[PDB]
Amino acid sequence: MNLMITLLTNFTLATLLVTIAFWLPQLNVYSEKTSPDPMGSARLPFSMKFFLVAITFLLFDLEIALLLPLPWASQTTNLNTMLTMALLLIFLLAVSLAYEWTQKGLEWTE
Amino acid sequence: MWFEVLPGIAVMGVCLFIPGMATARIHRFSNGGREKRVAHYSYQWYLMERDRRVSGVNRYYVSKGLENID
Amino acid sequence: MMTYIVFILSIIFVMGFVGFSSKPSPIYGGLGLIVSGGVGCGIVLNFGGSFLGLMVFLIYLGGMMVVFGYTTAMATEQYNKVVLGTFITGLLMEFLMVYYVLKDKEVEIVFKFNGMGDWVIYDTGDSGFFSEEAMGIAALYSYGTWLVIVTGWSLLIGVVVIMEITRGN
Amino acid sequence: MSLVYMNIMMAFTVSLTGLLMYRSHLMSSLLCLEGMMLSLFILATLMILNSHFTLASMMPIILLVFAACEAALGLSLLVMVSNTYGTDYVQNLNLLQC
Amino acid sequence: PFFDVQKKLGVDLDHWMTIQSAEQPHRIPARCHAFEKEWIECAHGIGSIRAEKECKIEFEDFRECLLRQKTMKRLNAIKRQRDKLIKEGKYTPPPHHSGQEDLRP
Amino acid sequence: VAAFLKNVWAKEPVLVASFAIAGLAVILPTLSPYTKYSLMINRATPYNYPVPLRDDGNMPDVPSHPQDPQGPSLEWLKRL
Amino acid sequence: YPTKETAHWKPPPWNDVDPPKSNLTLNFGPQGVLRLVMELSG
Amino acid sequence: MNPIILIIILMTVMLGTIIVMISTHWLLIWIGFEMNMLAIIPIMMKKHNPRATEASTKYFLTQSTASMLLMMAIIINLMFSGQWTVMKLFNPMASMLMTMALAMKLGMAPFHFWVPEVTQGIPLSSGLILLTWQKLAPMSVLYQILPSINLDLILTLSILSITIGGWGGLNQTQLRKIMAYSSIAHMGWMTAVLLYNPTMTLLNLIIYIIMTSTMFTLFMANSTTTTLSLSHTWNKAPIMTILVLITLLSMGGLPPLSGFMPKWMIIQEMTKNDSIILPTLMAITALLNLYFYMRLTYSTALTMFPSTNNMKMKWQFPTTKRMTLLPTMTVLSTMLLPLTPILSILE
């Protein structure tokens, strides 16, 4: 409960800071800004490379989560099976990186 | 002269040095002149609860030694 | 009140799902389901599963719904009644079941369900010098050979799928 | 069983009734799919952690990863619609009927 | 159909995860290891129909160990009776159920 | 096999360094004979109690006390 | 079996290929000083 | 369409299906299902046209919803059983959720609404794959869970699927939608018999797989997608018209052809369990199936539709396509009746 106490205290201090930054200068009577970017009227272009590198990040992070439990696993009895599994998984990461290299993935956003 | 920015470095040092010393002193004061009994595993927590039950005070940091037995 | 904390969070969890059940806009739905993922991970963490909770934080929230927000930022250009009606319907059903489980302490929807607090099914035993779920996860590299093989094969095949079906030619 | 179990069932039925009767584009359907994801993950983790089945801690993480890749596939599908009709609305999905 | 490659070429793939009473690292016991052991030893090699007709008591005990429904009902009835008896105030709880009893160790 | 090696070193030193390190990490656990030492180190860690077994009357390889000489000792980790 | 509701269903194209039914332009402000009209493709 | 990538993808589909077949754990069943659908997604995006994207989007949404229902059933079964052997379930809700999850996966009505659309928008090889190999794994899943299957739900799904498939195939003129509704009707026919004798289910599955493979192989060989080009094919090769006529005669269960083998023997396992009205109703809907089959053969071979002028150039070039396994699967779909008791090998 101490962790949640720290989280609540920190979140309330952030709330106090944003309340000071948002409502405290409203006491002043400066002006009202009527205010009548390079984007004139065109739609936002769908740069496909950003989406591709985002889902590549997603897949790599997923199998990084697969790769994670080695420090806990290092105390297991069957060390040979662990070594084979870890080397083959990192080899799978290398193979996926090589494929993402070959099929024009790392071009125009290298 | 190169010895003019070091007051800011010293203020940085005391600012980064105050919370560690503060939490060490608070840990030493709160746990009865001892460190905080860490519990990374359930056996350590069970010995923690055994100490709290044995102590007769419901505070483990007042530990009972050899004199508590006959 | 405190001892039902997980149950309370579970209620908030249901609330979180209502926060994107009506689906008014994908961005607000993503925010509501982010909040629901946080409270569901709190539910997991209160049962002693630190590793599974941080799996939820690291991968589900911080590594995949980030990609969901990235994709939905590529559409849904910036600037309902039945949305709000379904919101009040879900609110009424949620609160009605809340009074049902807080007064009767028992209900029937599909099976017999009890409303008593969940602090009676835990264990007073000790696992020793190790967390049970920590080496439960750690047993993957010693026993789970076929599962790791098919997982790596499926993820590599998903990489193949991403390279192929989004090429456009 | 426990009340949190029934709360997870009610959450899953909420995600089910949100996934079927949509009005918006495919992002709402994928968000409700992620609701199903989260509900199944929390239910499996609670079951495994309550009954002390140590090995079946392989169940929750795997129960994400596979369908997580499947979820990524869905994102690509939406991009295809975003490369064809401009908007990913479900009312534009009326070309295969005739 | 159900092709049994694992029983054919004699290689285990998922038999270890299949049951809760199987071998697990550091021999960590489940809550209902004995109940499941007795249920499986009751229902081995006799067929599913005779297993569900003859070993119903062991499976019911295993289900009660997993779900804990009768214990829930019993404890809820006891607690509700305690709340009622504190409402009309005929009985008072002893000091050993309040936290001031000089616990055993 | 010689000019191609120096060509891939001059073109992409990172890739050939990664391949060389991966090959070393593939071939060195099998070549180094200290893997069995880690095996007996991991297998001898007492995470659970060595629960005593009932003496029927005929068991010379088991002792009646932890200080008795018979049984598996762990002095090889002490000496190394 | 044409009815009123399905009276507008055209036959599908013989190759089963749907007909397909630009580039970014930037106006950099003057906020030396230069105003650039910039054309981008990503 | 890199041949290495296509080979790897096909091997992944085969591996996923065989993982569903040979596993003893529910998680591995779901693993095979997920890898199968993930690797079958690029098969329906072979031609790179927006209709394929539409069909694959609908297919992915339906299969993912079915998979989420499948985990709902698995987790409920774990709650009420505490074990993971692929066998009879230990909860009626688990059986109900699993039954409509597999009905959603297999395109059983009223969860059939994706089947006539998706098959309309994908190439004929992908349509053959979806209508032939995809049906194999959930048949194994339904076979391994038959003690806990509720009779009322599977019977309602079967009769609704047969009736809806016949009545929906009665109207379509495209070949792929007719094939989809015929597949729906055959799925209902061979799921109606599952609870009584699954050997009949396996026999009908093998017969339907062979006959649908023959039909799709003929459609890719003639390069015909609608009724009119299939009518026009009689200038090019009359022997192909004779072959499609005889296998469409076999497709409606008319003796002495192979298609009369399963359904009749399905009736042979309806009167054993004292059920008489049910095989009559499914026989009447099979007559509806035979009606639109007869319409297809009237359009194809039993008449002589008017052709165009360019057929003459098509008379100067033989069929250069890889007509693979067409004669063997054509013979095995017409003259297999006197070898009826071969179904004994499926026990």
Next chain:
Amino acid sequence: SMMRWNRERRRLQIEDFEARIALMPLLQAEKDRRVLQMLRENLEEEATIMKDVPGWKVGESVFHTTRWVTPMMGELYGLRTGEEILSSTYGFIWYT
């Protein structure tokens, strides 16, 4: 240097595990007496709380077998104050 230090750390881990192993039978006996005392107190309290309602046998175990079954948290601490319940069923997880 790190192989030497890891070997020394492994030796210290073996020593601490041996210390826990030699220590734990006393803890097992103490825990056994504790859970039996708690179960007897709960059984006696259940016997004397409700003597008026019909259809009740005291000590009616819900399991058909006569084998010993491990007690629950709710079976032991289910009749005490809320603070002891909190410190028992959530003390370890919430301990910092």
Next chain:
Amino acid sequence: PGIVELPSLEDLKVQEVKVSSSVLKAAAHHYGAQCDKPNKEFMLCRWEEKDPRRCLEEGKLVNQCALEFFRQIKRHCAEPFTEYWTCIDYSGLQLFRRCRKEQAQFDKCVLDKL
């Protein structure tokens, strides 16, 4: 079902080892070396009977002999034990590696006196 059988408190009243965690941790090795046979008897009974109610008296034997350990600590070499357990008790992790000099002193005092 059947009535669960429970022994009363009269079979559960014994003297208690009212000592802290570090007090048991400091002399745990000599605990395992000196009073080993009743501990082995009690846990073999516990592991084969799988029932506390059939092993209680055996545990009482342990709860006697363990006290016979501590008395032998108290009457002869109480001061080195006091130094050792307070040095162990200062550490929050209760590490054995940070009190090697007091460990050696206690070992030497025990080996000469007992």
Next chain:
Amino acid sequence: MFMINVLTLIIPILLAVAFLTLVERKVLGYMQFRKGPNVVGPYGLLQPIADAIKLFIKEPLRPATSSISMFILAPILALTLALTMWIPLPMPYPLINMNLGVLFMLAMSSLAVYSILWSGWASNSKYALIGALRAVAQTISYEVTLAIILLSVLLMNGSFTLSTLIITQEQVWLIFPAWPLAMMWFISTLAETNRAPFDLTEGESGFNVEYAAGPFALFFMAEYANIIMMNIFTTTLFLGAFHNPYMPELYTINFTIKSLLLSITFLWIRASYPRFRYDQLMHLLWKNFLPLTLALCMWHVSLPILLSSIPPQT
């Protein structure tokens, strides 16, 4: 007495990032032959106070907010993720001791991009959205390489607990047998904080252009808190100092010294190199950092088995 410890952790964080701004200002001044602020007080001691009071009374920028709730929530989330994340650092004992503290910091550092995403979404300008997407892509990739490097580091350590890592670094420092991992971690700490020579958040448009000056100040304090956090993390985990269990303030002084010189090295490196391009650092990871990092992970997961040096779990 716990809330006193929480306050004494969270208030010196704000003082430390204000003095980060002040010290960085005079160091960048003195690095480039000029002088820093020395007019307000003795050696510019009162400059951050003037900065804070100036930034806490100014007018906002008044943006056309598409989502007011998201615009409010983004700086609160940024400050929360920068401030509550300092807990598990062992100096010499953490405020809250977790068995998985490094995983905790890694998960929240991975999800810290939500503030950038919501800042991009709150501004209606599409170029700000494009810059936010570019920053998010860079951050998620660089979090991937951070995850691999940290995975290698704690598989060398063997346990996820941060307090045992001090015990691990007792004989020799971790930088001696993991120097190539040290260089990749130094580039990653230079690069993950949106810093020069990879600072694309200033060259051509920031991800918070339409945000007000108050939220901009909150974002800057959050970024500098993350900078000090990961600098102290590098100091603790690669340069672990001697820690007496009875005499802790020598360890506190020692790791404070290493943290101060590592922050000085940060200000040094930021003042010596021109900015890169987006495709340039994408090429830096996706074709040069990732295979070397994977090879290092392979080598460091194969080494302790062959060396009989598998570290203890406990």
